[PDB]
Amino acid sequence: MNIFEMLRIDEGLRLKIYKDTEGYYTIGIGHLLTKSPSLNAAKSELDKAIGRNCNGVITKDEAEKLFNQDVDAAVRGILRNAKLKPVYDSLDAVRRCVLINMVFQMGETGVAGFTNSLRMLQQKRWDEAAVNLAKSRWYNQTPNRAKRVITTFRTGTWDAYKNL
């Protein structure tokens, strides 16, 4: 199991513009297009992102290309961020993938806000950190995904995804 497979499980693949959980315009593997309520604003962003007139639809290959970019941007973001980098550096490989998963979903700024949790992961207090992460809007909104993520930080293995 690797980061790509893990995110492919959590986000799914969709070749036509759709609304994410929060109602935003998304495409492919969790690629947010715009927070704007306009489907047109959305289609414009898409063509800008793909380099072509897509008319709201993309190919598997294009989805995957956006996907490689997003994971890269996520990793580079953690590495450049002063609150995130140190935590990432302190973690084992599996747990490092988990932080990438969160950053991909909620953005660098969003994860950086989980001050207490970041401190606990750094100190390797797994159980305590799982309990604190669960106390968030994130968890309440996407409980099945959050639980997968949380269990992963908890045990350090891929069991939660081996099912899936």
For residue 15, say whether it is annotated as part of any ligand binding site. Answer: no
Residue of 5, 10, 20, 128 with catalytic role: 20
For residues 67 and 31, the answer to whether their CB atoms sit within 8 Å is yes
What are the phi and psi torsion angles at 17 (to 5°)? -55, 140
Tell me, what DSSP letter sits at residue 28?
E
Q: Which domains does the chain have, with CATH numbers?
A: 1-164 (1.10.530.40)
For residue 104, say whether it is annotated as part of any ligand binding site. Answer: yes
The SS3 call for residue 76 is helix
Q: Tell me whether residue 64 is one of the annotated catalytic residues.
A: no
Q: Tell me whether residue 159 is one of the annotated catalytic residues.
A: no
Question: DSSP letters of 42-75?
Answer: HHHHHHHHHTS--TTB--HHHHHHHHHHHHHHHH
What is the experimental method? X-ray
For residue 132, say whether it is annotated as part of any ligand binding site. Answer: yes
